């Protein structure tokens, strides 16, 4: 198949869309900045969506 | 047209093992070697070169 977010002639997200897949992508758009994408095991340094990428970046306080 | 020969439409990324889809510094789905000349300048000796890590033609950083 082709994923519903993909323009397969360009190999980019279709016109009007942001992203294809990933923990911080939902329905071809980025999740809002600050959305929690993984809760920490010990204590309170969670990982959060950036608003501008589809990955879930590691908390910078570590 | 068809799906681009370099594209995996299931992922919307290059097929596994390939580098890139299109661009002046992509050929056959791979990055051209860094230093390949991608645009010769008019007036001077400042030409633009492929990076070996991206598929675009970067503006020479001296200008």
UniProtKB/Swiss-Prot annotation, chain A:
Keyword Protein biosynthesis appears in the UniProt entry: no
Q: Which GO terms describe its cellular component?
A: extracellular region
Q: Which tissues is it found in, per the record?
A: Expressed by the venom gland.
Span of the annotated motif Cell attachment site: 41-43
Keyword Secreted listed? The answer is yes
Give residue ranges for domain Disintegrin: 1-62
Name the keywords, alphabetized: Cell adhesion impairing toxin, Disulfide bond, Hemostasis impairing toxin, Platelet aggregation inhibiting toxin, Secreted, Toxin
The UniProt entry, under SMART domains, shows:
DISIN
Recorded GO terms, molecular function?
A: toxin activity
UniProt xrefs under SUPFAM superfamilies: Blood coagulation inhibitor (disintegrin)
From the record, give the cysteines joined by S-S bonds: 5-28, 19-25, 24-49, 37-56
Localization, UniProt: Secreted
Quaternary structure?
Homodimer; disulfide-linked.
Q: Which family does it belong to?
A: Belongs to the disintegrin family. Dimeric disintegrin subfamily.
Query: What is its biological role?
Result: May bind to both alpha-IIb/beta-3 (ITGA2B/ITGB3) and alpha-V/beta-3 (ITGAV/ITGB3) integrins, and may inhibit platelet aggregation.
Please give the name of this protein.
Disintegrin schistatin
Organism encoding this protein: Echis carinatus
| Organism phylogeny | Eukaryota, Metazoa, Chordata, Craniata, Vertebrata
């Amino acid at each position: 198949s082709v994923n519903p977010c993909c323009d397969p002639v360009i190999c980019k997200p279709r016109d009007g869309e942001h992203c294809i897949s990933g923990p911080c992508c939902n329905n071809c758009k980025f999740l809002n900045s600050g959305t929690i994408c993984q809760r920490a095991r010990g204590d309170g340094n969670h990982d959060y969506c950036t608003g501008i990428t589809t990955d879930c970046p590691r908390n910078r306080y570590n | 047209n068809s799906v681009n020969p370099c594209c995996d439409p299931q992922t919307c990324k290059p097929i596994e093992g390939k580098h890139c889809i299109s661009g002046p510094c992509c050929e056959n789905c791979y990055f051209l070697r860094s230093g390949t000349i991608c645009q010769r300048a008019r007036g001077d000796g400042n030409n633009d070169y492929c990076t070996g890590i991206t598929p675009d033609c970067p503006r020479n950083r001296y200008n």
